[PDB]
């Protein structure tokens, strides 16, 4: 299960700079070991700050403030592929920001055969406004007349005596 | 001497021999009785509740 | 030996609580407190001799 970790890190003080800058990042990882490692990847990737010259000063797991209210989340990712340069924006409807990312990691792997290492989520933001939704399926999920038939569940107890009802 | 090795974490008699302190340990001691003050300032909450 | 064992257990409890109290104070004050790195590491070999 993924967890949203808030990681704050900075370079160690030296004679050149008395006080260093503080960098905070939000990223998703199963355990704090992965989050700290991914956080160091981004700073090197971005600020070109060495891990050996820096340290992690704060780590904190973040829980969903409103996990009982359905929301729509917009997610931006960067893709490393055969071309090695791509960027896409996707929308998901759920109750937990972490749940969107787990669902997000599912479709990239399903469609684009992508991996956890390649994807670097730039930003996740809740899209409260219905008009801001750019995806048709979410818009269909936002109508006041949501009522649809059941998707088939294809459910030892071998050798049933009677034909199953397989209906409502 | 020592024909067979006995685990102190299962044999209480061997544990009492090895550690002359298990007789008075008090593993569970109530610390937070009736105070439990929530210690998280608004500055920390704002930084945590970001993006 | 019994007195030494009790002192060690008292030291462990105080050292754990003070880490919690320091983190609680830093959290309330809004600053960041980084615990000290550990000097003890338990290493297990996972691959064989081939």
């Amino acid at each position: 299960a993924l967890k949203e970790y808030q990681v704050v890190g900075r370079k160690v003080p030296t004679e050149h700079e008395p006080v260093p800058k503080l960098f905070r990042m939000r990223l998703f990882a199963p355990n704090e070991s992965v989050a700290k490692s991914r956080y160091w990847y981004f700073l090197k990737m971005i600020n070109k700050v060495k891990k050996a010259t820096g340290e992690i000063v704060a780590i904190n797991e973040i829980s969903e403030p409103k996990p009982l209210k359905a929301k729509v989340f917009g997610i931006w990712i960067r893709y490393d592929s055969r071309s090695g340069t791509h960027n896409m924006y996707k929308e998901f409807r759920d109750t937990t920001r972490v749940g969107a990312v787990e669902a997000m990691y599912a479709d990239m792997a399903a469609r684009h055969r992508a991996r956890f290492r390649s994807i670097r989520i730039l930003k996740v933001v809740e899209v409260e406004k219905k008009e801001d939704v750019r995806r048709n399926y979410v818009k269909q999920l936002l109508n006041p007349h949501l009522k649809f038939p059941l998707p088939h569940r294809r459910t030892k107890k071998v050798f049933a005596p009677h034909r199953p009802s397989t209906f409502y | 001497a020592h024909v067979q090795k006995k685990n102190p974490l299962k044999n209480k008699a061997v544990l009492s021999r090895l550690n002359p302190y298990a007789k008075a340990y008090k593993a569970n001691v109530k610390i937070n009785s009736e105070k439990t003050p929530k210690a998280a300032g608004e500055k920390f909450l704002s930084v945590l509740h970001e993006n | 030996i019994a007195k030494r064992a009790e002192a060690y257990e008292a030291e462990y409890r105080a050292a754990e609580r003070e880490q919690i109290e320091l983190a609680r104070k830093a959290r309330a004050e809004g600053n960041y407190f980084v615990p000290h790195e550990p000097k003890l590491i338990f290493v297990v070999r996972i691959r064989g001799i081939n």
Binding site: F23, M45, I46, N47, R78, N87 | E50 | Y32
Partner: peptide, 19 residues
């Protein structure tokens, strides 16, 4: 050793990867 990092005048800045 254990030490504190004051956040006064050194507020954290949120970082995002470059697109």
């Amino acid at each position: 050793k254990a030490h504190f990092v004051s956040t006064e005048n050194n507020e954290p800045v949120t970082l995002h990867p470059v697109a």
